[PDB]
């Protein structure tokens, strides 16, 4: 249950690839680090579809192997959007095994522990400062077997510290499929 | 107390200097405007060390004269990292004052009043939009006489209005050594 970062492109790369909308880059992993021109965050590939926060993504297209892809799913209120995963992209398999012990992968590959404290909440074991989570929305929370449970949507912060998190239940990703 | 920004590199410069990790540029001033392929934040040298927030820097090396400077101190759980100051590097001194009257300096050189609200908490006299503080984590939280009391981490905001800050105190920086 480790995870490590890997850059595939530099700024010049985001820039030209956001302009031409075309990405000849091989998709590998599960969790992707993505970027727009004003912020960066993650995207988790589940059930053959790339999920991410509407707050980071908006209505934007995803650069693809054959040109830019249009979001095929969008739910502005539940802050989640998805693009059909480009052919030849790995995808996580859902959980539903009751485990309350969840681990979320941040943008630097830090597997930080969270206890499910609700339907879309999860108690944060080591209350990190909120700044710590910045740029990690869109990332997964897995159950002890490594299967997906949701997408880190935002931070439940108490004036400084983040002692719990909000995520899109994988169930609310399926009612939209 | 006033500060002013100065740009030292354009697009071509960050990209090449980030590839090689070779920055033969002479460092000046106490706070550095740093950027990665995605974000652009700030860094403050306090008593010999170029400090910054871990969410921005990850575990990347700083671009240095001798080449890539692997970082020295790292308290990820406090979202902190720092590198051994490069040649010249005008460091800042810790607090001494007790003064609860701080000032936050932004990436545009905005000396903005904050009131020491705790070990790491701090009130902003006049709230501004959270876009105002974008790209400033890593910046300094000074005292009346200009001493480094803390490295700015993130704004505390509700409804797009930022009214408080969350910083790491100069004292926990030293506790790291």
């Amino acid at each position: 249950i480790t995870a490590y970062s890997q850059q595939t492109r530099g700024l010049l790369g985001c820039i030209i690839t956001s302009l031409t909308g075309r990405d000849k880059n091989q998709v590998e992993g599960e969790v992707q680090v993505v970027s727009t021109a004003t912020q960066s965050f993650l995207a988790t590939c589940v059930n053959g579809v790339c999920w991410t926060v509407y707050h980071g993504a908006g209505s934007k297209t995803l650069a693809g192997p054959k040109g830019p892809i249009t979001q095929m799913y969008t739910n502005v209120d539940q802050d989640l959007v998805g693009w059909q995963a480009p052919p030849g992209a790995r995808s996580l398999t859902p959980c539903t095994c009751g485990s309350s012990d969840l681990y979320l992968v941040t943008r630097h590959a830090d597997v930080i522990p969270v206890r499910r404290r609700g339907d879309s909440r999860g108690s944060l074991l080591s209350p990190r400062p909120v700044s710590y989570l910045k740029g990690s929305s869109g990332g997964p929370l897995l159950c002890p077997s490594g299967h997906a449970v949701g997408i880190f949507r935002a931070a439940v912060c108490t004036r400084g510290v983040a002692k719990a998190v909000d995520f899109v239940p994988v169930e609310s990703m399926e009612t939209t499929m | 107390i006033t500060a002013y920004s100065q740009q030292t590199r354009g697009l071509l410069g960050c990209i090449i200097t980030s590839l090689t990790g070779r920055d033969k540029n002479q460092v000046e001033g106490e706070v550095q405007v740093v950027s990665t392929a995605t974000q652009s934040f700030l860094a403050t040298c306090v008593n010999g060390v170029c400090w910054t927030v871990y969410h921005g820097a990850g575990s990347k090396t700083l671009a240095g004269p001798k080449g890539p400077i692997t970082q020295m101190y790292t308290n990820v759980d406090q979202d902190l990292v720092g590198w051994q100051a490069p040649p010249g590097a005008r460091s800042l001194t810790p607090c001494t004052c007790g003064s609860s009257d701080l000032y936050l300096v932004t990436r545009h050189a905005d000396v903005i009043p904050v009131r020491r609200r705790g070990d790491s908490r701090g009130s902003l006299l006049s709230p501004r939009p959270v876009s105002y503080l974008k790209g400033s984590s890593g910046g300094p939280l000074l005292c009346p006489s200009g001493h480094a009391v803390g490295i700015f981490r993130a704004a505390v905001c509700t409804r797009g209005v930022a009214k408080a800050v969350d910083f790491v105190p100069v004292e926990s920086m030293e506790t790291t050594m």
């Binding site: 995870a3 890997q6 960066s40 995803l62 | -």
Partner: peptide, 12 residues
Amino acid sequence: GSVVIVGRIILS
């Protein structure tokens, strides 16, 4: 402009 994958995060 599009959203671009600038990196990946390998699980185990």
